[PDB]
Amino acid sequence: SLSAHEIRELFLSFFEKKGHTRVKSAPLVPENDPTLLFVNAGMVPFKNVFLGLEKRPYKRATSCQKCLRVSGKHNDLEQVGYTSRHHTFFEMLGNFSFGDYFKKEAIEYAWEFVTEVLKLPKEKLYVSVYKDDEEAYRIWNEHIGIPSERIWRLGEEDNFWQMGDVGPCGPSSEIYVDRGEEYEGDERYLEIWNLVFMQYNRDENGVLTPLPHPNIDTGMGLERIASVLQGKNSNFEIDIIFPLIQFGEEVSGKKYGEKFETDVALRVIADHLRAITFAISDGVIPSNEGRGYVIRRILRRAMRFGYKLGIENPFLYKGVDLVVDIMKEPYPELELSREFVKGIVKGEEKRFIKTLKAGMEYIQEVIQKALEEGRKTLSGKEVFTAYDTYGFPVDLIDEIAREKGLGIDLEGFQCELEEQRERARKHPVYSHLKELGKTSAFVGAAAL
């Protein structure tokens, strides 16, 4: 059935034989990019190289990058747990060309790997291309031989990528696996590989001109492709993740697959265990600002769901061990940080656990008092209290209230955030007034 570990190795060795230099995964924390909290895609560490800026001894590269989609324009944290495809931490397999090969080769390599290495049947495969990328269509249709019926021509929103507002961009092509009649939409036609063709440069006026040296960037989610080969209908059921779900069941005494709310809780724990382990192992220390606050929120969210399941004591620190045992083969450095990470996690849990419980009683109390008195949201005052008195992240407060159909008064919270400010000034993170509410979603109350 092929394990996630075997697929990771097959992918890297495959491109090595195609002249690609295997490149170690860059750390989750960017060495010199204060604006990006965490690496979210395989290409991030090669950005300056794609821009011709940095130089490299090789023109072809391949790697399995550790990624986190928990910030900025690539934030999936809210959805984690509610679907079977969303993750905070995940591995992206990718092959890159820096002014070397382009579309033809990129498509031939991907097709070869999928049909000849992974052994997925060609008739169950589909591909998408940009409606105006006649070049990509022809390669797929004539060179590879995909019947026109299995080739979709889509728009800018589906098949056109951009590094940003200005700069490199171009059409893209995705490969889909048809999982069968028992599924629907994107769950039936599961995207397994995205190929980006960096072909143009968009100037400050929006005008596109072809790059003198076009580039290639690809990304295949490891967890996702593993679920296909292993015959699972969820990323959480694959070999390298299911043990974390089972961990949750054990510590809670609850079973996976009986109730939706339960599964959500177990999935959150499993997913967040992976994120905290790798993030702390790469140097992130839980705090009330920046990278540290993201991990703190993730940690707190996992504690909240475990508590929701009835777990009364610290338990995440035991999950860290399981993550290290599962991931030590591809990431051996995790063993040298095992105890250090386990210590940080345990410390964090023992520090906030009582407050988490007290805070949950407070929030539920105002929630029930709200729907009782016919209110439809929590006031800014009640939000501030949960945020400032109990240390509850704003996103966590909202998630809890949402479970009861209530929302949080965002403008009432802002005014209250200003009052405390004016109060603190009369009666390192800098924030503009009117922006306090926004900032409060990414910093702890003490930071502001």
Side-chain angles (χ1 to χ4, degrees), residues 77 293-302 393 395 441-442:
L77 184 57
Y293 193 57
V294 177
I295 284 61
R296 171 156 288 176
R297 278 185 281 137
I298 292 182
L299 252 170
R300 200 68 57 73
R301 184 163 186 264
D395 299 319
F442 301 93

Side-chain angles (χ1 to χ4, degrees), residues 356-409:
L356 168 65
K357 301 183 190 189
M360 282 311 294
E361 158 177 49
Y362 166 73
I363 306 181
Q364 293 304 358
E365 184 55 292
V366 292
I367 278 179
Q368 215 51 47
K369 187 176 178 301
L371 48 72
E372 179 42 39
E373 279 140 62
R375 281 197 294 293
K376 305 298 170 185
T377 69
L378 298 173
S379 77
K381 185 170 297 305
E382 305 167 310
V383 171
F384 185 68
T385 299
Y387 176 64
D388 186 62
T389 298
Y390 293 101
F392 275 53
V394 178
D395 299 319
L396 183 58
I397 298 168
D398 184 54
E399 179 162 41
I400 297 174
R402 184 160 312 219
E403 312 186 325
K404 296 286 193 307
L406 297 169
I408 56 183
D409 192 16

